[PDB]
Amino acid sequence: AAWPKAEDPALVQELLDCVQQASHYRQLKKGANETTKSVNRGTSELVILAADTQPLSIVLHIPLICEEKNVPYVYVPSKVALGRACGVSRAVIAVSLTSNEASDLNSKIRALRDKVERLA
Amino acid sequence: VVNFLLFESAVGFSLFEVVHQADTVGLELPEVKDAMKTLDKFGKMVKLRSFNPWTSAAQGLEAINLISEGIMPEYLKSALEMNLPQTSGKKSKVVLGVADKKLAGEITAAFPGVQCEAADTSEVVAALLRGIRTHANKLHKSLQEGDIGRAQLGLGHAYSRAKVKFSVHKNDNHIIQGIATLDALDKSINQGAMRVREWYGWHFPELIRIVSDNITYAKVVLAIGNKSSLTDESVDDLANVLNQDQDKALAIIQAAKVSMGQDISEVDLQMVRDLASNVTSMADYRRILAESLDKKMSEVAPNLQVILGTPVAARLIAHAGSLTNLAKYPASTLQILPKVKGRISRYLANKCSIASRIDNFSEKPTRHFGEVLRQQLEQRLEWYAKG
Amino acid sequence: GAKAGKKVIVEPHRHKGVFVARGGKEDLLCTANLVPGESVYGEKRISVETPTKTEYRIWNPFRSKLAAGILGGLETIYMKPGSKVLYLGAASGTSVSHVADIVGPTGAVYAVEFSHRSGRDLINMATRRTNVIPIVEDARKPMAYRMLVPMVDVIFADVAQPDQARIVGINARLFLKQGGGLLISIKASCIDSTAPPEQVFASEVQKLREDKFFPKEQLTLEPYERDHAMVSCVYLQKEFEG
Amino acid sequence: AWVADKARFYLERAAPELREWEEKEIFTKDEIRNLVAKRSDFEHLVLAPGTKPTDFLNYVNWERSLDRLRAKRCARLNIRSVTSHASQARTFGIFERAVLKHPGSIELWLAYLEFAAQVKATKRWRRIMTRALRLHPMNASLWTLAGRRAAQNGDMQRARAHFLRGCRFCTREPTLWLEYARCEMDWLARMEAKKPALSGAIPIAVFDVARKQPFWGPAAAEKFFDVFAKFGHLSCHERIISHVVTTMQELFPNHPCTWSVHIRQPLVGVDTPAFPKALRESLARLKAALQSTTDRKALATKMVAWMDGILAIEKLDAAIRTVLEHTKRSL
Amino acid sequence: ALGLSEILPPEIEAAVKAAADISMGTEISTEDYENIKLLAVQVVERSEYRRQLAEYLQNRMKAISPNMTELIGALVGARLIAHSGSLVNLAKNPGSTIQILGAEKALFRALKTKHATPKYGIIYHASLVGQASGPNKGKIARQLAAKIALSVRTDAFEDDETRAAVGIQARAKLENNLRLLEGKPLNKGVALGPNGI
RNA sequence: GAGUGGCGAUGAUCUGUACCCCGCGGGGUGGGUGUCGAUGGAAGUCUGACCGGC
RNA sequence: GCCGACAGCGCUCUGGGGAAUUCAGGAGGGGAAAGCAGAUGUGCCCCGCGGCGAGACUGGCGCCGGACGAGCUGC
Fold first, then answer.
1. Crossing angle of helices E30-64 and B266-300, rounded to 10°
2. In b/e form, how buried is each residue of C207-219, taking b as 16+ CB within 10 angstroms?
3. After which residues does chain E have a break in its backbone, defined as C to next N over 2.5 Å?
């Protein structure tokens, strides 16, 4: 069910790096429930999930509402890599990252979901 | 120079001779747009050579599910052997207009003397066909009975369900409306059963003292009839009803032996046994709904039932509408639908969320995962119980 | 604000089949419920009887680009009770339910979606309503559902694609009438994320225009969305119904 | 509507034969007044927008009965060199305009084939026939009529063209398979009647190929036995019947159709000492078959239908007639 | 009966075979069909209980007030009995009151608000004020209410065609009075020729 | 020398169902509830002599 | 909510309204196979031009081309 699977040749790495930079700019909603709140409230600019979920059904619900809100989603293959990409000390299973009016981070979100649009 | 073309529609194939062909250089001209806009001019361009309906909606569903990927069927090759002339590409060919490129290549592959202009390539047959799609209601009305839009609608539900595998794993229906009717008829049997207790109890007082459990009252006042003709152990029933020897039956025949109230008549007793058969058949149907409802819910979404029980899991699935909606809600939104009480309210709300989306988005979901969810519930109950 | 049980009267909107419900401290755009007693995705709705029957689902510009355009001040929406609408990019059938509430029982909505899961919720909603057809196919392949869609009056377009004008281009070249309605939602961040949004909007208008539409008006959806445009145009004629 | 214009072409096209009928002594002048006015009323009715196949057949019936009226009145007044071909050409025009406007009307198509057959227009009949088959390919009426008239004309290859394309198309009902076994065995009846033809494995191929079809059932196989059960004067009818009964008793061996052909199987090549002989042989198969564990009600209804299905024959033992009446009473 | 011709007249059951053919039937299992089928037999059991309850109330009201039954019927008269509570407490009320039984919200709205009082109450669904139309509705509502105070007063203060000796006379007078009200000529109008002469 | 047990994004914690009277225990009214009641209340049961035909 | 002077402004004038009908136009919707691009009776045989087409030879460089032809059919 991971048909937007991100490729380990550095697209995963740019995803997790932009996760970390958004974590340092506090633009980051972590975990599946808070990701779901950000997508349902429409604050979300991009959303990554983790395909290393042991039952992946517990994150399969957010591609629905991301298709409804028309925000790009993409899966990285490790919730541990996403977890310390956030800086959490636990495994983050699905992360959402928003934006503001003016930031270089918002530019990096723009180019990043341009690459996600090249996937989907 | 297009000779024939092929219009494939949700009721069947139909291939048209075209004579007085289109202005292949002046297609974007406004008067040609008018002649491609009204029926009384374009119909001078198109005839109707053949129509081929669908002998069954199964043939329709295989017809979509071949023509979407772009493969012709053996009956389409049949109708084209029927209609097209026997041609190689030796000395005289036949141009056919086809709305699909791979169907064109397969159809020139099967028939060597047809040559097919596809409406993705050439705007001549794209327009000459686009206008058969505009007027193909009136163009087909003389031979196809009934509307085309319903055959389209059913064929689109059929192709969406056959492509997505919809109702093989969508069984939400049988518990939302089922808990609606279950709580509804529980209210009804409380109402009417309280009525028959009020009125036969108006005839015969102390049966309210010996026998509670309203539906067992209703069956025992179906069987006891009148105040007159009593024996305690009459026929094969009261041992299966309740206690017999020391407790109830002597209070029944003794209570009517020392009875106190008003007498009643026969047609009134017909009201109390028609109303009694009302209440006890309502209770039997309640047993049927709880049995098949709990079995079905443990066969469809077991996680909410093991962590909650099928009446309140039924109340949440009817309360949010479907497994897809309740799965789409977050944790605290399910928490919409001292601090220890609200704290464990938040914890069971969160596990009911995780149980909801694990309950829906498996194919035919299992049972032990909700079992280990209730194992976490028991060890958090123990996590407070260390106090 | 718009609490459950507040008295709020309903008057018609300027468009055909669109309603506006004015209350004491607020107003709420709303459509008429085609299947009464049932909310699709859990929305507030309005019940009233003739002087049981009449019901009005409240329609959200934050969950619907078309409600964002109607509250955005759009001249026409091309859709009326009786229309045929080709909806593009139909996730879960929510705005497809509001369009189906506009065109009503005698209308027909032809919902197209690529994803199977929104396909499933679309088959739930489209099993409840009988004027919407479910089509789960690729919008980049209109010859897949050329056996399913007749010549429609309106095309609504909400896809998050970089080749959006090409997709709507070939879909209109197969299914949209002579002088047809087209109503496209555009996300400038989705087409070109490194360009300014007015330039992305004007370039998409130019791609429709050399795709032989005729742009009537453009409005940007910006008290309700950011960097979203709604372009209202008409296929092969300057004036709509022909 | 420009019905006065196009109607004006058809009326002015009709005029010189009315000229010749006025100048011959055949019709009189007020008769031609009624005739021109009624031609006109039909032409405006027919070229009118909202029309019906009933209306087209009304004007065909009236125009053709006009041609017969002028024919008999011509034979009264002993005229010759007046001809019918403007009437026949005109009637082909009414039909061509008819099945151009309402082409999904098998009343129009069968009536136009009837006219084209009654005026001895054979090649044109085949052209109309092919156009009718192309607009109604799921019509066993048309495929049967094309195959049968092709067979009676004598071109069995063209008959088999119409039939094998027919069995390709009409595959819901068994009807056209029954008529192609019926017409192919009609041809084998012609071949053995004139005496490949010695083997005749073609309707056996129709049978064994017909196994794999969506209609293929036991009652339909009993209709195959009703088809093959006639023309018992042949070479290999026992081989064909025997293959049908053998194959049904290899694929559906527990059905009262198979027990019914187990009864009626020795009565194929009969029509006479063998008639009570094979009749009592059918009493051995009958008493052997009615006791068999199967759909006993269906076999009982089939044998009420069959014992009733013999009664019109003469020259029979009245004890056998009465005891089959008592067997109908007993079942 | 579906999942033949006794339940419903034919050629509509041809339509239910037609919609049974071409409909959008989602093939649910026979267990769920057993649940919806047992709800069907539940509600047709309640329809049979409606039939015999209706015959119960008809025969019982014939035994309690035959004057009422031989004016307006068991259901409407039973609802008058149910409003005022009992037979003697229905009999203690005047004929205008028995006209306005069932319309007390509009009635005290009108009387406290200086407006038009309601013409009838429960009475409207009898077999007679429904038979009339126009001003005959309020008029026969009045006189039916007067005759029915009289008849229920006879039943409440004392084979069945001598016990029902008031209701038959009030039926004959009140239905004859009906047809003399309804079958009336219009207002006399002059006829004018082609020239207005 | 071997085999068990161990929080947290698969969601920790915090403002918030009220106030008050007492030694984690108890009590006076909450407000929203969901029931069946109830006799209790809003709450009292139209007008009254002509009209139609001719 | 009716009435409303003076001053000022606008529309209109065989004064201003309402209804009935007769006549003259205009705009829009919906319905309609809504289809007179070349309008020659039918059938057979002989010729002429051509199409399918089994089967058969050949030239030049793995192809392309020539030129034979049972039969069947169109016009």
1. 160
2. bbeebebbbbebb
3. 3, 158
Nearest CA to D216 out of D164, D169, D262, D171 is that of D171
Q: Is the CB of B191 under 7 A from strand F?
A: yes
| Chain B meets chain D (3+ C-beta pairs below 8 A) | yes
* Cα dihedral value B228, B232, B233, B239, nearest 10: 120
Give CA–CA dist C126/C148, Å, rounded: 15
Give chain C positions within 8 Å (CB) of A42: 62
Phi, psi of C101 (to 5 degrees): -70, -25
Question: What count of Cα atoms within 13 Å lies in the side-chain half-sphere of residue B37?
Answer: 16
Residues of B within 8 A of A55 (CB-CB) are 358, 362, 369
Spatial distance between the Cα atoms of C176 and B11, rounded to a whole number of angstroms: 20
Distance of CA D96 to the CA centre of its chain: 24
**Both ends of chain B: CA-CA distance in Å?**
92
How were these coordinates obtained?
cryo-EM
Report the C-alpha gap between C148 and B157 in whole angstroms: 10
**Chain centroid to CA D291: how far?**
39
Inter-residue contact C99 to C82 (CB < 8 Å)? no
Report the length, in residues, of chain E. Answer: 197
User: Distance between CA atoms of A11 and A7, rounded to whole angstroms?
Assistant: 6
Helix (H) or strand (E) holding E67: helix E66-69
Distance from residue B107 (CA) to nucleotide G44 (C1'), in Å? 40
Through-space separation of residue D83 CA and nucleotide G42 C1' in angstroms: 12
E16/E28 Cα distance (integer angstroms): 19
Nearest to A61 among B332, B350, B361 (CB): B361
Nucleotides of F under 7 A from a protein CB: 8-14, 17, 24, 36, 43-48, 54
R_g (Cα) of chain E, nearest Å? 25
User: Which two tokens mark C107?
Assistant: 């209308």
B102/A81 Cα distance (integer angstroms): 45
Sign of CA dihedral A97, A101, A107, A112: positive
- Cα–Cα distance measured from residue A86 to residue A35, given in angstroms and rounded to the nearest whole number: 13
State the Cα torsion D257-D263-D268-D271 to the nearest 10°: -130
Q: Hey, are the CB atoms on E32 and B274 less than 8 Å from each other?
A: no
Chains C and B touch, using 3 or more CB pairs below 8 Å: yes
**Residue listed under structure tokens 């028995």:** E98
Q: Which helix (H) or strand (E) holds C187?
A: strand C176-187
Q: How far apart are CA A58 and CA B353, in angstroms?
A: 9
- The set of residues, in sequence order, having a beta carbon less than 8 Å from that of D94 and lying 6+ positions away, is D46, D56, D59, D60, D63
- Does residue A76 contact residue A48 with C-beta atoms inside 8 Å? yes
Strand G within 7 A of C198 CB: no
Report chain B's C-alpha Rg in angstroms.
Answer: 36
B 246-305 residues, CB < 7 A, strand G: none
State whether the beta carbon of E181 lies below 7 angstroms from any atom of strand F.
Answer: no
Strand partners, C219: C230
The HSE-up count of residue B255 (CA atoms within 13 Å, CB side) is 20
Residue with tokens 């035994």: E63
Nearest nt to the CA of B338 via C1' is: F17
Q: State whether the Cα torsion B281-B287-B290-B294 is positive or negative.
A: negative
Q: How many CB atoms are closer than 10 A to CB C136?
A: 25
Q: How many CA atoms lie within 13 A of B225 on its CB side?
A: 8
d(CA A118, CA A11): 11
Residues C185 and C69: their CA atoms lie apart, in Å, by 9
